[PDB]
Amino acid sequence: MSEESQAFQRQLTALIGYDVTDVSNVHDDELEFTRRGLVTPRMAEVASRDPKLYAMHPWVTSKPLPEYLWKKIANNCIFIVIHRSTTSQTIKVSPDDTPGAILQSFFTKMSEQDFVLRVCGRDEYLVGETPIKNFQWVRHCLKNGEEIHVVLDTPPDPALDEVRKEWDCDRKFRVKIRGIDIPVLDLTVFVEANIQHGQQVLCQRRTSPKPFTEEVLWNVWLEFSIKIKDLPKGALLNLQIYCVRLLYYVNLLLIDHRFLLRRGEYVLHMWQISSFNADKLTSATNPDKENSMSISILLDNAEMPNQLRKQLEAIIATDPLNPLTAEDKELLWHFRYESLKHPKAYPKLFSSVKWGQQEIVAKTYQLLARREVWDQSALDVGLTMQLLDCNFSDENVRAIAVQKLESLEDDDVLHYLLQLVQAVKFEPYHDSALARFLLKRGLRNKRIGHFLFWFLRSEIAQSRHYQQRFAVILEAYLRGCGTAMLHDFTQQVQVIEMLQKVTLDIKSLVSSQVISQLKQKLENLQNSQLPESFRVPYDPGLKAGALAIEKCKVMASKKKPLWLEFKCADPTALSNETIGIIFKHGDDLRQDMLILQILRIMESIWETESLDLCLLPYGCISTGDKIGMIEIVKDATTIAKIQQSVGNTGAFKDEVLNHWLKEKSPTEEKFQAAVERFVYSCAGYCVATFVLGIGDRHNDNIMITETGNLFHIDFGHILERVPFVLTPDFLFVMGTSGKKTSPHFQKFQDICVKAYLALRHHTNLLIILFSMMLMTGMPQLTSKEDIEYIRDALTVGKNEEDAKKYFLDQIEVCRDKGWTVQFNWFLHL
Ligand SMILES: CN1CCN(c2ccnc3c2c(/C=C2\Oc4cc(O)cc(O)c4C2=O)cn3C)CC1
């Protein structure tokens, strides 16, 4: 169209944070070609969308209600409190009761159906043909022993979710290196050209060294061994510059999105370094044409023996990080069809394919066509993710992984959403099955869409390597989510943008001269700019309204984070506490997202085995670059603020925590409950942090609720080693003093092992989330050793006895250290 269309595209660009129509930094039309290609998948999903359920986005699981939540249901009954204007009942319900059956048990008890059950204060709906025990909110209240308060009102209008309608010979490969050109510059340099496929180097030619000047020309043809015929789809031409150190890199797809051999002149602006990270794989070029180093090039082109079957089974049995010897690869490949029967063998098997051989690749495709076994295998996420990491560039291979993800219920997609989004950094092409899966699942569920938005926007705002790709995916999604969401997103984006300017102008300018500037700026923004209401990005069901200027402060700390507090915009809120949101800058919150999300994954893992370690993965979302927001946990203090209250330099007292708990819990019952919550949470976080290798933390980065719930914060990181924090003040709450035993220190040791072995049951899953996390989220170019940590931490190989020993050993290391490490953080300061 015109003024309205162009304004709609302007609408999107503002939401995205990047102009998808911009073509300044491309050398082909892949991005555009991807924008067009994504239209069909979008429209199909939109055209299959059930309006009523999409508008009400019920949050549901199929998983059996955990044992520890069953025990919290006495007479096979669950009480619900319905509200009408000023009305309240309390219908006893069966855990197997459908919502519709309950309203039926309501209007009989005391347009008829024109009503629906909405959670009080929240934008959450308990609807659809689902046992009332299988709603997430209902499982939430149960865990927190809360009353399920539900207001009865009218179903939301599906009209609000309306959508605004719209080569190749037998010649060997060769590349011409013209030269390099950097405006501004140990004094020698050479260009290395790698043919890469799935992180593997198929062939590698180098140039002669030359003096390192602002303009170095070679004008040389690099001849490779591999013929043009044997180039696999997805092969990257990896161009790098060494001085013996790696300075710059850039990649070019040898085969494009149209299956055309890429030929012609290219001047590629490179990224500079400052070895396994995902950024090294990007096909995008550096946008900063002014300063970036440039590169110029020209393209112009029976039965299986018993002992061997046991060899194979052994190989297949090893963990992902276990390297395959050439001997192992030949065995796996030669016995393709026997390996095919073992879904767990796939990752290794396809790591055994010579991708530089067209004939081998074809045989491989003939293997995948023998779908049966794979297709009928039970969904194994851990295994599936392995096929979607950096070791796999082949479309067909990666596609069968995605195919397996299709059978994930929404609840499960949420658990892995952040990782799957990140996993797009490993796709050779912009338009991939993985991208479409995310897009498809985002448009089908509002809650998944919401988090898809922020996960994508998070990367677009701070990752120049992938922002272009993520923007095209984000736009596609935005064009199908409906108007209601486009409007809500618009508010959230504005709020965070206004709260940005504020948190920025404060760090520069804790005095009351700032307490004055703060309250003055908030009042100004509130009176005029800040929207009436907006959704909490890390808790979308919750609507935050007006500001409580009186409550808003500015935390004292290295960085100057804003501590805000909003009034809920929902009148039917069965409470009147404010929403506390922290707005921080100066730290990349993405790493924290990844950690918190692996934390939630750990909880579910523990749920599949009827365990609850009371972790507390608070809300945390990167909203722009270097900034973001963090949920404020009510009734919570830092472990340090409780100690440094006897407040001194160093000097920790063993029973200040206990005093604090007792002081904060009114009854010996509520206190004893807090002491139990502490035992669990403490165990949960000791295991969780040991496994992830982030256990050695210090006081002020560990918090506790007044209900005795422990939880770590700020996985910045922020500034003798200890496996994890288990200080004498923790132990004292458990009754033990260095060193003996108590009913609760025995419970602790028990839980830890139960939880630890539980995690080890899913070794492969964690291993692969760990390695991915590091490759897509962590600063450093991670080496093989960093990742090899999870192997060791999970005692790979060893039995459940040697393992239990290993961990209880760790527990003792901490006990022997006491306050040593904590005291050191001061001493060193
Ligand atoms: C003394 N002072 C302690 C912190 N504070 C809280 C008080 C109550 N709850 C809280 C917080 C809090 C804070 C932070 O959480 C983070 C998480 C990250 O990944 C990185 C970070 O830099 C932070 C961070 O600064 C988080 N929650 C859930 C206010 C009071």
Swiss-Prot record:
Keywords attached to this entry: Angiogenesis, ATP-binding, Cell membrane, Chemotaxis, Cytoplasm, Disease variant, Endocytosis, Immunity, Inflammatory response, Kinase, Lipid metabolism, Membrane, Nucleotide-binding, Phosphoprotein, Serine/threonine-protein kinase, Transferase
Subunit structure: Heterodimer of a catalytic subunit PIK3CG and a PIK3R5 or PIK3R6 regulatory subunit. Interacts with GRK2 through the PIK helical domain. Interaction with GRK2 is required for targeting to agonist-occupied receptor. Interacts with PDE3B; regulates PDE3B activity and thereby cAMP levels in cells. Interacts with TPM2. Interacts with EPHA8; regulates integrin-mediated cell adhesion to substrate. Interacts with HRAS; the interaction is required for membrane recruitment and beta-gamma G protein dimer-dependent activation of the PI3K gamma complex PIK3CG:PIK3R6.
Origin superkingdom: Eukaryota
UniProt-annotated location(s): Cytoplasm; Cell membrane
Catalysed reactions listed for this entry: a 1,2-diacyl-sn-glycero-3-phospho-(1D-myo-inositol) + ATP = a 1,2-diacyl-sn-glycero-3-phospho-(1D-myo-inositol-3-phosphate) + ADP + H(+); a 1,2-diacyl-sn-glycero-3-phospho-(1D-myo-inositol-4,5-bisphosphate) + ATP = a 1,2-diacyl-sn-glycero-3-phospho-(1D-myo-inositol-3,4,5-trisphosphate) + ADP + H(+); a 1,2-diacyl-sn-glycero-3-phospho-(1D-myo-inositol 4-phosphate) + ATP = a 1,2-diacyl-sn-glycero-3-phospho-(1D-myo-inositol-3,4-bisphosphate) + ADP + H(+); L-seryl-[protein] + ATP = O-phospho-L-seryl-[protein] + ADP + H(+)
Disease the record associates with this protein: Immunodeficiency 97 with autoinflammation: An autosomal recessive disorder with variable features. Affected individuals have childhood-onset antibody defects, cytopenias, and T lymphocytic pneumonitis and colitis. Some patients may have features of hemophagocytic lymphohistiocytosis.
Protein name: Phosphatidylinositol 4,5-bisphosphate 3-kinase catalytic subunit gamma isoform
Gene: PIK3CG
Record PTM Phosphothreonine, positions in chain: 763
Top-level enzyme category: transferase
Lineage: Eukaryota, Metazoa, Chordata, Craniata, Vertebrata
